[PDB]
Amino acid sequence: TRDQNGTWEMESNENFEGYMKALDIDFATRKIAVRLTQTKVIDQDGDNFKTKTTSTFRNLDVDFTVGVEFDEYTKSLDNRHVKALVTWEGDVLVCVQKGEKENRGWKQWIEGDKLYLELTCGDQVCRQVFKKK
Amino acid sequence: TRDQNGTWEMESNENFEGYMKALDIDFATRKIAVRLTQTKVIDQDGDNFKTKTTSTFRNLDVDFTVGVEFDEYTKSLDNRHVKALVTWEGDVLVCVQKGEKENRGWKQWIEGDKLYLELTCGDQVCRQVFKKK
Structure with missing residues (x-):
């Protein structure tokens, strides 16, 4: 055909x-x-x-339980080992990635139909916005 | 929430x-x-x-009419200009990309529920297989 x-x-x-x-x-x-x-x-x-x-490209899954520290190898980025801990601050999901880099982590929350994700490393902040499909 | x-x-x-x-x-x-x-x-x-x-990542659209030669800038790959001509050989769609590279082109055809695409450049052949979704 x-x-x-x-x-x-x-x-x-x-x-x-x-x-x-x-x-x-x-x-x-x-x-x-x-x-x-x-x-x-x-x-x-x-x-x-x-x-x-x-x-x-499909990234590695990231699975976690809030309040339970876990090992993360950041294969999608710099391929480093960090000890990540996710906690709630109100309705904001807050992660600290303890390791070589100072002030490394992220924060994630919902507003309206959108998900906000702020990634930090040192003095740098990356802000991502996602729409619900 | x-x-x-x-x-x-x-x-x-x-x-x-x-x-x-x-x-x-x-x-x-x-x-x-x-x-x-x-x-x-x-x-x-x-x-x-x-x-x-x-x-x-979304690549640039590629639009063409069989039998009508067209200019192609290969932005998704080596960013070169070629003059592409697509013709039918039976049910096989055959493209010759005339330009700097010798034996550059591709061939594309359907067998069963699958699309086959063979890309050539010089002595190199890349074979891709796609399933119909």
Whole structure:
């Protein structure tokens, strides 16, 4: 069939490394791209094609119980070991990540239809906002 | 509310760069990570949390008509200009990407519930397989 319409989820990707190297893509980018999975959306009308591609990586799950300190290896970021403790301050979920970095942690809370997450390390604050789907 | 259950899609991410730099994450990784959007799935039962996070990047759309040569800037890969021509060979969609690289192109076809995509550059072949969702 010539009908390639649909939403297509990558199951297999062989020698993406060699292909990217042949295209002179830098080592650091190749290290990251080989870990990604793609979803390809094809909208086809006769010989007219529109394709949309998204690349995704799944991070390690983070599971915890409030009030119970746990070991965290921060593989999605700097790959360090921290001892994390999550507590409630009112309706704000507060985490302290004890380790090499000073003032490392995060705070997470709900307002309206949105989730707020503030990440801290040293004097740096990152603010993320998520909408409920 | 302390109930943070749900699927949460990132709408905003401020100073992720400064945070990552504070964590000593390498330049090349930071260049990539600032472009990503996250989906956070929270499964919460009392003070028991399970969180799953996925990071995604959306690539540029690729639109074309079979038989009509078009200009392609390969932003998702090596950022080169090629003149791409897609033709049918039977039910196989064949693209030649004319430019600096020799033997650059791809072939795409359906078999059963799967889409096959073979990418070539020089002597390198990458084979991807997708399942229909």
